[PDB]
Nucleic acid binder design. Structure first.
Ligand SMILES: Nc1ncnc2c1ncn2[C@@H]1O[C@H](COP(=O)(O)OP(=O)(O)OP(=O)(O)O)[C@@H](O)[C@H]1O
Ligand SMILES: Nc1ncnc2c1ncn2[C@@H]1O[C@H](COP(=O)(O)OP(=O)(O)OP(=O)(O)O)[C@@H](O)[C@H]1O
Lengths: 114, 541, 58, 48
RNA sequence: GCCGAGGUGGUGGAAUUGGUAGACACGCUACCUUGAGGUGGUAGUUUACGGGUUCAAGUCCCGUCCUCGGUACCA
RNA sequence: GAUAUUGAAUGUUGGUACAGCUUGUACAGGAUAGGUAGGAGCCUUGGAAACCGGAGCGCCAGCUUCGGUGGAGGCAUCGGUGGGAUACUACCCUGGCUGUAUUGACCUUCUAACCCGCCGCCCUUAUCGGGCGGGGAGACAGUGUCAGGUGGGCAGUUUGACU
RNA sequence: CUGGAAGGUUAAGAGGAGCGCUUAGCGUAAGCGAAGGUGCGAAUUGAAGCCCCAGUAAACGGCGGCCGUAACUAUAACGGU
């Protein structure tokens, strides 16, 4: 294929990037822990850059070239992963900043120091 | 179909019954591997199936006659250079033919296993093909044996060689062969599971035995009271004596139930796993400087190995010496330690006590007892020094065998004990890890890390040296290469600096953008664009 | 329960176990009720499965 | 341990004799010359 | 008195003849850290006994002593 | 569980009975030589050198086939190598695809056997059963033989002597 | 008990490598011996169960020791194992 959508989910531990096909069929996937970083280094935006690089390498086989990147999850590695999809040979056209916002929904687990 | 069958095969020598009640099968192209402790008939079994040795009991039936026997130490092996398919093996592995006696130990098994593979064989009875091999030859073995005519039966001592090159395993154990098909990695998964089943069932019958003996003792201590506290009041003396009989009839019924369930159970206590404890001391107060080999040159007529290879190693460090096939590994230690065309200078400490280990097993005062061999001065010098060190470090009640009528998977162990008993403060291990066992080389892998320095560890393994390496001597073309790291690809000046600096500044700009995405608006964008383009420009050159 | 074609029925013999303990046991007919014309009409009687193989008209 | 030993002949192959020996004090296959009544003479026998 | 059980370092306690003043967790000692304690970090002390068997003994064996408990005189 | 009632299709992975043929280099070398025998010539207008495309292997050196441009050229002893000569014959089972016939196993699906303490009609004023017509299950189930496990639910029995 | 089941084992039925026995024949003897009949029979396949992995106690059942420590006169809130 030529076109797909890049789902980045960056949460406070991990930044998982799956480059999928438009009606949701994953070409290749790699996480920050898949690259090898096990500790807190999973949270650094360099691992998100590396994960976007590995997902870009995996996506260009049977292939695809022009992405459409959907940012999900509250984290840090969104900007480096969008930039690293560009520098790894792909094009990033649209940027959907879609973290799942509940309106009121379920109640969160308790705050931590209490 | 099968080709060779075994039934209740045993063997008797002057230690004890090595081997008993052995039931196994060789088939049409099985890759069968012997594992087992050394000295456990690992290669006596091969001489039984070869009919090289006649078994005391048991019937060994075979069908096809061709039995290729490739053993350890075939000791001035012949130079019948015939049936030239051997020379294909003798020239893939890069081994010259010209001699036998001046060859290193590394080449001679590759020149014996060569003649063994190609006489003609539908059945291979080979002892240990994985001693002194480099990985380009160790990998060549598996491509031989996968692309091979028939069945292979090997005694490996390798978890490495059997993950690729095994279909069955004939594990030798406590005097009994047991076979398991499929792999070696899942084989120990199978053994640990059967050990858990037998340990749970022995723990259950031992617990039940203690329970029924306790509830039998409580009834006895009641029957004694109930017999002694009768004849006092209320009812004559046989209404109360019958109650003692009523308890004492149960006290025997439960014992008969106990003995019957134990004769049906027959669940033995689990034999323990094998440990060595082995360790080391070498705690002598030592100086600093040990070995200065300057301007060395070694040649064999026109065969030139060393030329102007200047290296200097002092005390207290792990020196791994790696040669892929014939780098002179064995030759350097001889020309470190000796004369005979060490051309140049080899200076060594005069007061250092260099304890030497050989590759070749040809330095024994043969037909001597280990009693007379090992220096055992008075009383506990046999026990607390020596016999504990043997039995604890793999020996049976084998205090006096002739030491190469021994097992030959010992006699590396004899050298080893003679070193490590006495704290010699300098060791050089010219290929130790190949004759030893997966419980034997492991503890030498461990304690040599806790060893107090000055080690010269030649090892064709890649995983043994990961515990015993700080610096390397990679023998190569035109002499040595004293490495202190990987030292490949000639670590550079301009391009490496540009790459690391541009990547670190790139991660600076990326983290500065990604920490706060909407603030200090847009200098970071020009920064990252120019830095990424310049990184591509530097990597493009 | 006997077959209508041949006189094949339930007999009796022994359940001889190990230790040759003679228990007392019956032997049934593999009979398999099917539709056959024993008269001019079909009547759906018991048959046997020995007599059903290729011999008697369905 | 102590083992029952048959001592088969070599000229006749006939068994003809039993005595006991150790597996430790005599680990090798023992041989003697005894009388073979088929051979009607003294003959070297052999543990089998 | 009889039977059954255990007798190790200050403590509780594992050890199928193969190295233990102790191998394991605590105490204890000397130092460090702290204002001084505690925690924390570093190093340090012949198997109840006597006589064997053994190349080797806590273990295997023969005897003595102690303590738990059952089994008795008596109140 | 097998087997008998109990057969009709469509794929599957092994193996035969008839069949297709391809895969082959340690170095020296102009190269890819598996070896045993003949061997001084063969292939060409029913096409050679060369280019190109693709199935195919490859120890990526170079081979293998097929088709398409081309136009009379390839290729062999001998020359060299080295342990051994290149044009047919077979094999070697090292490493594939495709079809016919069965063979074993597995998955689906069908319906005509079997089953229906499902409906309607008739025998028939019958909650029996049994003929017909539908529906449902359907090679299962049930049932017979054979077998293993389970089985105090039941049965026959044993459970010593001196004192 | 309940659930799982990758794997080990595990029957009969299947399969039939082979080895006997007999025998025309070949062998001066000694012995070998095709085909057939027939006796036995290995490798392979072969479920449930069991081994294994989890849950279940208003299931069957089971529910500890010893040592120190407080103005002493004693116990131990406490600590160790
Ligand atoms: N020829 C022999 N005579 C008496 N005893 C022997 C002989 N060979 C070996 N032994 C004893 O039996 C043990 C086992 O010897 P075996 O034949 O199993 O060699 P192996 O152990 O198979 O070789 P490896 O040690 O490499 O496994 C030896 O270590 C020795 O103690
Ligand atoms: N004295 C000698 N004469 C001729 N050749 C020699 C001599 N010593 C060594 N060589 C050659 O040197 C080569 C390498 O031998 P070396 O001493 O490095 O042992 P190695 O290669 O490590 O083998 P191994 O690992 O079996 O000891 C061998 O091919 C050998 O023929």
């Amino acid at each position: 294929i030529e076109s797909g959508i890049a789902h980045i989910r960056s949460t406070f531990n991990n930044t998982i990037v799956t480059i999928t096909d438009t009606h949701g069929n994953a070409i290749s996937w790699s996480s920050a822990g898949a690259l090898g970083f096990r500790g807190s280094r999973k949270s650094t935006p360099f691992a998100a850059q590396m994960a976007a690089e590995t997902a870009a390498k995996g996506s260009i086989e049977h292939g695809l070239k022009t992405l459409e990147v959907t940012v999900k999850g509250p984290g840090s590695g969104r900007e480096a992963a969008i930039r690293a999809l560009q520098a790894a040979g792909l094009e990033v056209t649209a940027i959907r900043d879609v973290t799942p916002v509940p309106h009121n929904g379920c109640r969160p687990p308790k705050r931590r120091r209490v | 179909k099968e080709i060779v069958t075994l039934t209740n095969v045993s063997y008797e020598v002057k230690d004890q019954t090595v081997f008993k009640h052995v039931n196994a099968s060789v088939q049409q192209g099985d890759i069968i591997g012997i594992i087992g402790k050394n000295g456990a008939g690992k290669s006596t079994l091969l001489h039984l199936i070869h009919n090289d040795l006649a078994p005391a009991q048991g019937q060994i039936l075979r069908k096809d006659i061709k039995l290729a026997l490739v053993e350890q130490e075939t000791a001035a092996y012949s130079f019948a250079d015939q049936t030239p398919a051997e020379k294909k093996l003798l020239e893939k592995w890069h081994v010259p033919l010209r001699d036998f006696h001046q060859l290193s130990g590394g080449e001679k098994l590759k020149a014996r296993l060569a003649k063994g593979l190609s006489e003609d064989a539908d059945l291979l009875l080979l002892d240990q093909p994985t001693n002194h091999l480099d990985e380009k030859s160790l990998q060549f073995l598996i491509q031989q044996l996968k692309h091979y005519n028939g069945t292979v039966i090997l005694v490996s001592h390798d978890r490495y060689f059997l993950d690729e090159a095994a279909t069955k395993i004939w594990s030798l154990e406590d005097q009994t062969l047991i076979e398991f098909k499929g792999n070696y990695s899942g084989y120990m998964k199978f053994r640990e599971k059967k050990r858990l089943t037998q340990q749970r069932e022995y723990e259950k019958q031992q617990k039940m035995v203690e329970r029924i003996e306790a509830q039998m003792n409580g009834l006895a201590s009641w029957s004694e009271k109930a017999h002694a506290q009768s004849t006092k009041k209320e009812g004559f003396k046989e209404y109360h004596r019958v109650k003692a009989k009523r308890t004492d009839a149960q006290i025997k019924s439960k014992q008969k139930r106990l003995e019957k369930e134990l004769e049906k159970a027959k669940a033995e206590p689990v034999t323990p796993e094998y440990t060595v404890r082995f360790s080391i001391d070498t705690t002598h107060k030592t100086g600093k400087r040990f070995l200065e080999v300057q301007n060395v040159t070694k040649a064999f007529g026109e065969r030139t190995l060393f030329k102007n290879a200047n290296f200097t190693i002092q005390h207290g460090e792990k020196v791994a010496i790696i040669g892929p096939n014939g780098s002179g590994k064995t030759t350097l230690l001889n020309i470190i330690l000796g004369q005979e065309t060490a051309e140049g200078s080899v200076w060594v400490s005069p007061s250092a006590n260099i304890g030497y280990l050989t590759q070749e097993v040809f330095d024994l005062p043969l037909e001597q007892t280990p009693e007379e061999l090992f220096e055992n001065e008075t009383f506990k010098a046999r026990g607390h020094v020596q016999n504990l060190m043997r039995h604890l470090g793999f020996t049976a009640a084998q205090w006096t065998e002739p030491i190469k009528h021994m097992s030959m998977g010992e006699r590396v162990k004899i050298k080893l004990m003679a070193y490590i008993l006495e704290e010699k403060d300098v060791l050089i291990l010219d290929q130790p890890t190949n004759h030893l066992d997966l419980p034997s080389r492991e503890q030498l892998e461990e304690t040599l890390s806790q060893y107090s320095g000055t080690l010269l560890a030649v090892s064709h393994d890649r995983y043994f040296l990961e515990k015993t390496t700080n610096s390397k001597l990679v023998i190569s073309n035109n002499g040595i290469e004293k490495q202190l790291a990987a030292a490949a690809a000639a670590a550079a000046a301009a391009a490496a600096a540009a790459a690391a600096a541009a990547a670190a500044a790139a991660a600076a700009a990326a983290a500065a953008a990604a920490a706060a995405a909407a603030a200090a608006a847009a200098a970071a964008a020009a920064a990252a664009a120019a830095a990424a383009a310049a990184a591509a420009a530097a990597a493009a050159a | 329960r006997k077959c209508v074609i041949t006189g094949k029925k339930t007999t009796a013999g022994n359940n001889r176990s190990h230790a040759m303990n003679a228990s007392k046991r019956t032997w049934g007919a593999n009979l398999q009720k099917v539709r056959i014309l024993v008269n001019g009409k079909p009547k759906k009687v018991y048959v046997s499965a020995r007599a059903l193989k290729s011999g008697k008209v369905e | 341990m102590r083992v029952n030993i048959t001592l088969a002949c070599t000229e006749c192959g006939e068994r003809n004799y039993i005595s006991k020996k150790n597996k430790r004090n005599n680990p090798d296959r023992v041989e003697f010359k005894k009388y073979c009544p088929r051979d009607k003479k003294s003959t070297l026998h052999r543990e089998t």
